[PDB]
Design a protein around this ligand. Sequence first.
Ligand SMILES: CS(=O)(=O)N1CCC[C@@H](NC(=O)[C@H](CCC2CCCCC2)NC(=O)c2ccc(CNc3ncnc4c3cnn4-c3ccccc3)cc2)C1
Length: 336
Amino acid sequence: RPTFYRQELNKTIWEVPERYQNLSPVGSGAYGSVCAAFDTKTGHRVAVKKLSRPFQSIIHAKRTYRELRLLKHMKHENVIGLLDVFTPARSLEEFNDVYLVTHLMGADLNNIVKCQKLTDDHVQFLIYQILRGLKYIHSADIIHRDLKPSNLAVNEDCELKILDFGATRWYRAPEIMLNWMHYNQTVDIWSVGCIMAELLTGRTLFPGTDHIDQLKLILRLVGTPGAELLKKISSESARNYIQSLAQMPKMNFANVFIGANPLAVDLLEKMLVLDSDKRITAAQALAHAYFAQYHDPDDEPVADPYDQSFESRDLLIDEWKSLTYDEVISFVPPPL
Ligand SMILES: CS(=O)(=O)N1CCC[C@@H](NC(=O)[C@H](CCC2CCCCC2)NC(=O)c2ccc(CNc3ncnc4c3cnn4-c3ccccc3)cc2)C1
């Protein structure tokens, strides 16, 4: 067990191993309780996040568990990984505080776009990397559900990591804003479509004042729902609403991206599909011709089996808090 040290940072008690020095608060608050540190073991900068009110309720307890269970699983170049998870607690009796260590983020994809006007070489490479990360995540039966530029970290090499820091609206698949039952991984693909369009056009594709405004901007671009789609909505009320919000004059798809590489527009067209059963998968996307320059199949792995069975459980804080401790004590850092 390592030696820890106390610290007040913005009226917040920060106890960490001494290997993590120069803790400095980052994200102006909005990213939760996060500090930039210096990993003295490796001499790189890192992010320490102290988890906030982690065992307050069943929901918070179970959510603390899922996160640690997820971070510990992600061993892929285009997805966030865990360098370190620690607690000051010398026992389960005392366990209340959880700290997570990751690479420090230099820029989100948002910052990138503010900095520079991206080329088609950039857009190919960036989207290739998101779809690669998604192929891995999807293989483990994990859906991101909140893919957006602020959750995409991008380095000096334009190398990219998918993460979730916790406007979502702009990038959200339409089935979710209509609260339909059926939900597949391709909700993420919709988001990649929205993100890619933004990288091509430099503007929010569906900049919707509210969710109803959003759904109008979508349906005028991706068409009044087809016979095929409507034949999969159950409620008369829902079907009448969906076709009721598709009363904006229809728009021409390729018109919206005049100037873009046609191979890009071709790909966008297979991502921004109303019918999620007919929307392309991450693994198919990787084989699209727009990624000729990068797409290597032998180098686009799937994840290992991910035990998600805890998702279905109604347990007590002390079960959640105990399963969490198990996972903290038993963590094995990645190699350097
Ligand atoms: C459903 S739920 O309810 O469980 N759900 C609630 C909302 C938050 C969700 N988070 C996660 O479950 C994911 C892990 C799940 C994976 C993520 C990848 C896709 C597949 C699923 N967790 C993460 O992705 C994460 C991110 C950062 C950290 C710590 N690291 C930083 N935390 C803040 N800020 C930072 C840094 C680094 N740099 N910066 C930074 C910020 C600003 C400026 C400079 C640097 C820790 C964890 C969980």
